[PDB]
Structure formats: structure tokens, C-alpha cells
């Protein structure tokens, strides 16, 4: 186990903070909120999204061919 | 009245003679368990406002205890000041 006071060494940093009863819990919730989640979404679409559409494409084509394999089967049997 | 309560908590320093036996519960606990080197309550006044509290000095692993004890005393007084300690103050 590790306690405060024995964690690590810190040089010259000041930290100002404020009482919760003195500030808002939702500063600019929407004003600053939305823009940021856009920003984080943007920042990550390209690594998260691609594999999922790949699965998405393989899922719809996969069931497609499953029905068209049997149902479509006949087809032609002419004599 | 604030000055009286402050007197009750008082001050401490590691060169005070009489440790364990001090009337101030904070002071006695600080002395017996080596919670600090020095503490002192205070009541700064300016027009219509002021800072009222305590200031202490201690080792890096005692800041928590000192605070606990300091605060527990403040509360004790808010809710349980007994009669004689007030005379002393």
C-alpha cells in the first residue's frame, strides 16, 4: 500500500483551487461542452469507426448471401 | 468571545515545558504524539472582515493529524464547550 506523504518528490508548483460552494457545478455546460465532444469525436473517429463499418459491411452482405443461397437456390431446374 | 475560544485552543511550541499535561486538548495531543513543532490560533481584524483561525508547522507526515485534531477542536467548541474551559479562556 502507498500513502500520501510517501508518494513522490515535487519541486516548485503552486495549485490554486476553489470551494465547491463558491463555484458552479456546470460552468458552461453546453457552451463549452458540445464543441469539446465534437473535438474528441473528431480526434478519434478514424481509429474507432473503420473496423466497425467493416464489420457492418460484412454483416449485411453475409446474411444477404445466406438467404440468396437457399431461397434463391431454385433458381433454375429445367427439364 | 472568539478570543476566548482561541485562548482555549491556544498555541504550542516544542520548547514549552509541560507537554502531556497541557489544558489545551490540541496542544496536549500535539505534544504527546509529536504532531508538530508549533501552532497558534489567531484572529486578524480589518474593517468589517478578518481572518480567524490557526497556523501550524510540522513534519510532512503529520499534516493530516494536525488538521484533524485542529478541526475536531473547533467543532467541539461549536457544539460542546464546557463551563470551566471557558473560565480558563
Q: What is the Cα–Cα distance from B89 to B24, expressed in whole angstroms?
A: 10
**Resolution of the coordinates, Å:** 2.6
Asked if the A1-79 domain carries CATH number 3.30.465.10, the reply is: no
Render B40-75 in DSSP notation, one character per residue.
EEEE--BTTB--EEEEEE--TTSHHHHHHHHHHHHH
Specify the pairing of strand B52-57 against strand B38-43.
Answer: antiparallel
User: H helices then E strands: how many in chain A?
Assistant: 1, 0
Q: How far is CA B6 from the centre of its chain?
A: 7
**Please, which residues bridge with residue B46 across strands?**
B49
Residues B66, B58 contacting (CB under 8 angstroms): yes
A9 → chain B, closest CA residue: B60
Render A5-73 in DSSP notation, one character per residue.
TSS----S-------GGGS-SSTTTTTTHHHHHHHHHHHHHHHHHHHHHHHHHHHHHHHHHHHHHHTSS
Min CA distance, A1 vs chain B (Å)?
16
Residue A54: which residues within 8 A CB-CB, separation 6 or more? none
Kindly list the residues of chain A whose beta carbon comes within 8 Å of any beta carbon in chain B: 4-6
Which technique was used to obtain these atomic coordinates? X-ray
Q: What is the Cα–Cα distance from B65 to B36, expressed in whole angstroms?
A: 9
Min CA distance, A5 vs chain B (Å)?
6
Min CA distance, A4 vs chain B (Å)?
8
Q: What is the Cα–Cα distance from B66 to B76, expressed in whole angstroms?
A: 15
Kindly list the residues of chain B whose beta carbon comes within 8 Å of any beta carbon in chain A: 60-61, 63-64
Cβ distance A4 to B60 less than 8 Å, yes or no, reads: no
> Number of residue pairs across A and B with CB atoms under 8 Å?
6
Amino acid at each position: 500500500g502507498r500513502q500520501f506523504g510517501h508518494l513522490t518528490r515535487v519541486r516548485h508548483v503552486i495549485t490554486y483551487s476553489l470551494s465547491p460552494f463558491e463555484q458552479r457545478a456546470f460552468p458552461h455546460y453546453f457552451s463549452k461542452g458540445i464543441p469539446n465532444v465534437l473535438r474528441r469525436t473528431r480526434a478519434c473517429i478514424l481509429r474507432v469507426a473503420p473496423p466497425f463499418v467493416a464489420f457492418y459491411l460484412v454483416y449485411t452482405w453475409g446474411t444477404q448471401e445466406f438467404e440468396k443461397s437457399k431461397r434463391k437456390n431454385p433458381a433454375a431446374y429445367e427439364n | 468571545a472568539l478570543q476566548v475560544a482561541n485562548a482555549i485552543i491556544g498555541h504550542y511550541d516544542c520548547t514549552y515545558g509541560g507537554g502531556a499535561h497541557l489544558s489545551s486538548p490540541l496542544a496536549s495531543i500535539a505534544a504527546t504524539n509529536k504532531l508538530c513543532q508549533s501552532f497558534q490560533t489567531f484572529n486578524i481584524c480589518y474593517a468589517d472582515t478578518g481572518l480567524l483561525g490557526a497556523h501550524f508547522v510540522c513534519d510532512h507526515m503529520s499534516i493530516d493529524d494536525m488538521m484533524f485534531v485542529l478541526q475536531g477542536q473547533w467543532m467541539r467548541l461549536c457544539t460542546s464547550a464546557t463551563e470551566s474551559e471557558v473560565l480558563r479562556g
